[model samples]
Every structure is written in structure tokens, then in C-alpha cells.
Target: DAVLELPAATFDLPLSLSGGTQTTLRAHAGHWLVIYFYPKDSTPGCTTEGLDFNALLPEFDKAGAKILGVSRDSVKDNFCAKQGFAFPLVSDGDEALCRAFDVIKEKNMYGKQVLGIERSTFLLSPEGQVVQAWRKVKVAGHADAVLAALKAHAK
Candidate 1:
């Protein structure tokens, strides 16, 4: 799906951050925002994804980009602290951001029907336009791909 067809305005949903802080998407308006959606917190794939982003914080900061990982579970300071993730992980338990991003989809979890967050990423311009997007994301080298895309968009 094209991100242009998704919400163009800032996502104003109240979000809980990893440090027990609360914020809205509008707070990140001035920089390139790489907002990535994952299925669950601390799971193998999610952990790898978060770690990949956390490891690239220097490059992302150099490019003037902020990274955010979102999931349906509540924010986990333990996970961040344990993994030493400098970027904040958002708790989207209410699914407000999920609905806004249109990432929720039905899946067959062990042949049982389950609604889950599709792994996706959106690169938002400083002005709030989604300049790049990736859907059904795979964990391997995904952060590097995002950084490369960000470098292109940042210029």
C-alpha cells in the first residue's frame, strides 16, 4: 500500500515511551522520523529489529532522523535497558496509532485467526509527509535499508 494514501497529518495519539514518559507524534515533527511497526516486544524478530536500529543510532542521528519502534504491548523499560536502546519504544496498546497507520491485519497464528500488527516502516519527512515506506518487513538488514533510504531522503 502507498503511504501517500495513509494518514498525512501527524499522528496525535497519546503514546507511552520506554522511559515511562508520555508523548504524541507531533513532538517529533521537525526531523526525519523512521516509524517502524512490529508484532511483539522482545520477541526474537522484534529484538533483532530494535537492536539493529539501536546499533545505528549514530548514523540515524547524523542523518537527522529519529527512530521509533511501536507495538501493541506496553512500553518495556526492562527491554530497552537490557538492550541499551537509546531510542524510545512506543506502547500502542490502545491501537490508536495502529489504526492511524493501518497496520493491523488478520493472520493465521498456528491456524487460528488472530489480528496482529504487520511489520512495517514509514519514513516521514520533516513536514509530515511519508516519503518512503516498507510493508511486511523482514528483520535481516532492514535497518541498514532504512538508513540508506533515509540518506537519500535526507539529501
Candidate 2:
């Protein structure tokens, strides 16, 4: 189960970001963190989620917040460039970050059940404490909701 308000783990894990850029978790500190976990890249639902968040990026930045889209795929396939996403889409292929966030779950695909990263979003305060979470997220109007949450939580 996903837990909220837990002190997030502190680590400088190297992130394989979209467009072949490298970054660390600590690099996102000192600002509100919007870490969203998705199943795959270029999929229908995932694309919608990415685009929705991309559209609201200016508002997010104005609120002093950073957005990160996470997936377990190794190849980003120019998804960010093609979609013109403003935020980084992290490639957590090793599942390190996925495990840390506890978003991995057993999902039913067709007739078979498999373990995958559930579509989820977490809103972390500037202090890195998770203040709000949305599990099993629906793409429609999701980014707007997250932006509202950030505005509501921030000073």
C-alpha cells in the first residue's frame, strides 16, 4: 500500500532522464516536488498524462514546484521531445525509485496478472515530505488537480 506523509528517503541516486540527461534526486530539493509514476511511455493514457502536465508547467513553476514523470522503461524514444514535455521523464528501469515510492503493484493485463507501476502521483512539500498522494490516477484533468494541490499547500 502507498503511504503518505512518510519522511521520504534521502539519496543522491543517479537518474536516467529523458533526452539522455543525467540528474539526481537531491537536485530537485528546496522546491515542491511533483513525482508522478506511470506504467510506460508513448502509451495512450501515459501520453495524455504527460501532455496534461506539460500544459500546466508554467503554473507549476510559478508555484515554485518541479514535476517529474517516472516510468520503468529504459528507452524514452524521444517521447519528451516529440510531446514537448517541459518536465523530465525519469527512466527508473531498475525499479529503485519505484520501490522507494511503493507504487509498484499487481495489475491485470488482459487475462494475466503482472506486477507494474500503478499510475500515481505524489505531492511533496519543499521540505521533501509527501503531503498529498493520488493513487490509481485518472489522466483527465489530473494535472489541474495537482496544480491546485500545490497552490493550496504552498505559502
Candidate 3:
């Protein structure tokens, strides 16, 4: 499937967060949302990125925003990563959400090709429209960059 540009408005989708009841995007309709897509859980870069975002949770809340990490990992894996990193990770085990956001991509690793997620971030407005999008993200300082973007674009 071809990649999709950011959607014009918020749309509902099922999401399960660590230690929380399953909810839809509608549940966060009034707040700016940072919906980030990562390749996998508990890997080196992924772990660092998750921890950085987790550390910035308070700042995100202060900016009147919510951060959600999405990946193809199972709910159990999500739970483990969340617990280990002390962050909120959402299950996209079937890649449904990733597909919608167009983060899943053809990847080349060690001279072999495979289908996987291209690290990306979507900044959604309060109404759920995608305000900003970043693809093939670098893990270092990315959460801070997203936070800055959220503050600048949200208001």
C-alpha cells in the first residue's frame, strides 16, 4: 500500500495503553496528541526513545498534550516495555494503526529486505487533525523536538 499523508481530522481507533482500560482516539479528542510509531519494543534505540518520552510526560501534560507510543508489538510486550521504561506504550500488534498512519514501510537491514515500521511521529491537533508529521525519525532528542512542535502548533 502507498503511504498516506496525515489525515485532515481526528478519527477513532482502538488503543490499549499500559495498565489502562482500552480506549479510542475519541477519548483524547480535546487534547493535542503525540502519536509516535516505532519499529519495535525494548531494542536499544527504541528503549532510549521510550525512556526519553517517558521522562517528558510531565512536560507533555503541562503543554496540554498526551503522548502515545505505537508499535506492532503485542499487548504483553507493550506492557513489559511500559513497565520497564516507565512509560505508556500502546499495542498496534496487527499494524492497523501503523498502516493508517503510513509508518509501515519496506526496510533494508543487513542487506536483507523486510517490512517494518519507519520511525515516525504525528502531531494531532485537539480536533484530531494531523498538524505535523515526521518520518524516518532519529531517536536522539526527538521527544523534545516533538514537544516543542506541539507547543508551537497547538496554540
Candidate 4:
């Protein structure tokens, strides 16, 4: 739906989502969907960020939200990505979703121009509407900030 304003699409990308299984966008009909794209799994930044969301999930649940992590690392590969969290993480190795979301960027990691996820987050409405999008996300207290935005900004 264009109302979502996300250019939202449907896929069969392992729906566990660290929440319960809600495979299609249509399945998440009355709740907020928090889709966060990270660079990799088990890395310090990504894991810590996931942990923050995990810890604050209850609060986010109260605010009518569920967290979904995305990465270039596919779910079928990064099994550890799912083990430590209560939310589901997606792997977009093909970069279809990444291209749609425009998250893949040329970065200077190890002094190299490597293409990687820019650490982004999108808050989708119950109807797959995008209420907010966060980019270049900072790990510290970022979840708290998003919770605040959801409470205040989201309809």
C-alpha cells in the first residue's frame, strides 16, 4: 500500500522476526513493525544494538511495536543472530531490500571503500505504513529515542 509510503513489498524471508512469525506485511496488520538494518551479526555494534531493543522490547510492546533486524547476512546463515534475541532478523544478501531501502553505502571501514548497511531503522505502521525512518543510527540510547518517537510521533 502506498499509504505505508515505504515502497513496501512482500517476501518469504524467514519471518520469525525475533517476535513471533509474521511473514508477510499483511500479517502484521494491527501493530507497528520496527525494521532495523544492520551491517552484520555478532559484531559489537550490531549485537549491542539488538540487545538494546531486546531489553526495551516490553516497553516497545506497550507502545504497540515489534522489532525486526535486517542485514546482508542471511537468516539461514547467521543462526546466532536469532539465538540471542526475542526479535527476528532478516538477511538480504542479494540486496533487493537494501536497494529498495537505499541502505547499502560505500563506507570507509579498515580504510577501505566497502559497501555495507548504514545502520538504519524504519517504523512501519500496522498497515505497513512507514511512520518514521532513522539512518546512521547511533547505538547508545538509540532504542530509547525510538521509543520516545513512537510514543510521540506515530499515529
Candidate 5:
């Protein structure tokens, strides 16, 4: 699932959020979905990315898009991140969504090699098919790029 080239309206996976029960992917339908996969919560890059997305949320909504941040962190971490940043963060604790979207990858940290999530974002159409994909994303200005892409593609 490197590219998430699924048919329209074709995915169903639980997304856990703070203070809310788990929800299925189909729970968000009839609108464009921007699902971003990040490595962890409270980290520098992840925090900036989340805040940038939060700041641009109104613009995303105006373009008929909803943003959902996903990471391998637990619900408690997600909740703290979400509360501290005041944005929507989803817990992909089991890495189900990460595995499905193929964002997990091998990486090198401090001379140590390991497999982990490579920062990526998926712009899914209203029908759930991926419209655009950004892999190995650099945090600076990435949210704006995503917003521009959504506006350009949204009907």
C-alpha cells in the first residue's frame, strides 16, 4: 500500500482520539481528508507540524478538507499533545494505519538504524482514494503546501 491506491470509499480502520471512542476511517466521508503520519508526539518536528496544521485549519476547512494527525503514540500521549496544542491528534498505537499507508520505513538515528515512520501526508479525496502523497516531508511550510494541494484538487 505504498500509494494508497484504493478504490473510492474503500477503507475502514479505527482511529482513536482523546476523550472519544475509536472511529472508523469511513466515519469521515463526503469531504476531503488530510491524514498525516508522523513519528511521535511532543517531538520538535512533530510539534511544529501539528501547530502549523492547526493554524491553517480554517483554510483547510474552507477548502472542504479535514485534517487528522496520526502517530504511533498512545491515546494518553495523543491527548496531551492535542490538549497542549489544541488540535486533533489520532492514536495509531498498533501502527495499523501506518502500515496500511506504508509510511513506516527504515531510518538512521545517532548511528543506530531502525525501522520507524517516515513523515508523510496523504491527501485523500472525498471518496477515500488518495489524490496526492508527500513522503519524507520536511516540516517547514509543509502544511501550507498541503493546503494549496487540497485547494487545487478539491471540487
Candidate 6:
């Protein structure tokens, strides 16, 4: 996906979650949304990132924000109702959402070049404008940083 600037983003795509709601970006209008682009589920980095975001969800709500995690893996691919997750995990297997936010990356993993998500996150307003975007994001304490940023703009 091509990175659409926050204001012109007007981003809305159909999504799938883990035993959660079938939703879209437009449904979350009028609030802060954290769309974290992760590589995969159950992997070390992605797992840690998910748990971090999950732990902070309550605080995020207090700061007037909501969140979702997006990945190339579809619900049919990996989502499970048995393994509970705090936030919904939406699949964008075609990578349409990836291109829109420009989170895809060419990586040299295992000494072979491959394309995948480049751990990133965005904070969007209810109006669907980007309040902030963190590219090539590191997972540790990142959720707190997002919360801090949201407190400044969130109601």
C-alpha cells in the first residue's frame, strides 16, 4: 500500500478479528485509533507487541483511544477463539491496508530477501486524520508512548 498522508487518508477497510467483531475503520470514527502493523502472530516480536498493547488497553480507553492490530495473516489463517486477545486482530492478507499505510518492508531475513510488514503504528483521530505515525516502531514501552501522545489530543 502507498502511504496516504493522514489528512487525505480517509482510510476505511473491512476487517476480521479474533472471536471479535467484523468491523471497519469508519466504524471507529470520532475516536483515537491505534493501527499497529505487525509481522505475524505468535512470533516473538509480534507476540510481545500484542501483549504490550493488550495490557495497556484499559489505560488507552482512559485517555480516549482505541486500538487494533493488523497483519498479513487472515483470521482463517491463524485467529483462534481459544487464545483470547484484548484487542481485535484484523487480517489484510492482500496487503491493501499495508500499502495504504506504507508499512510493508523488504527484509533480509534468513539471508533471503522477502517482503513483509515493518512494525509500525498510527494514531488517528475520529475524523480519520493522522495525529501521529511511528514507522519502523520498536515494541518495548511503545504502547506507553502512544498513550502519552493520545493524552495530549484525546478527550
Give the worst 10-residue stretch by lDDT in candidate 1.
74-83
lDDT of 6 by residue, 1-155 (tens): 22337424335566766544567788888888888988863377777777788888899887777898888764422433234568788877578788888888898877988788888998888778777888888778898898888887765
> Which candidate order results from sorting by TM-score in descending order?
1, 2, 5, 6, 3, 4
Show where candidate 3 strays beyond 4 Å. Answer: 1-10, 18-21, 74-87
Q: Which stretches of candidate 2 lie over 4 Å from their true place?
A: 1-10, 74-81
**lDDT tens per residue, model 5, 83-146:** 4545567778778788888888887877988678899999988778788999999999899999
**Global lDDT of each candidate:** 0.82, 0.81, 0.75, 0.73, 0.78, 0.76
Worst 10 residues of 6 by lDDT: 74-83
TM for candidate 2 is 0.87
TM-score for each predicted model, relative to the true structure: 0.88, 0.87, 0.82, 0.79, 0.85, 0.84
In the range 8-102, model 4's lDDT, one tens digit per residue, is 45433334444444364565678888888888633778778888999999999988988878777544234446458887666565777777778
Model 5 residue 154 CA deviation in Å: 1.3
lDDT of 2 at 66: 94
Strongest candidate by lDDT: 1
Native-vs-model 6 lDDT? Answer: 0.76
lDDT of 2: 0.81
Give one digit per residue, the lDDT tens place, for model 3 in 1-155.
Answer: 11245443325566776555676667778988888888773477677787888899898988999888877754323333645554457777567788888778986777978788899988877877777888999988899999998888755
**Against the true structure, whose TM-score is highest?**
1
Instruction: Please give, for residues 39-145, the per-residue lDDT of candidate 1 as tens digits.
Output: 86337787789889989999999999998888877443345335657888888868888878888999887688878889999998877788888999988989999
Provide the RMSD of all predictions against the true structure, rounded to 1 decimal: 2.9, 3.0, 4.1, 4.0, 3.4, 3.8
Error of 5 at 69 (Å): 0.1
- Per-residue error (Å), model 6, residue 93: 1.8
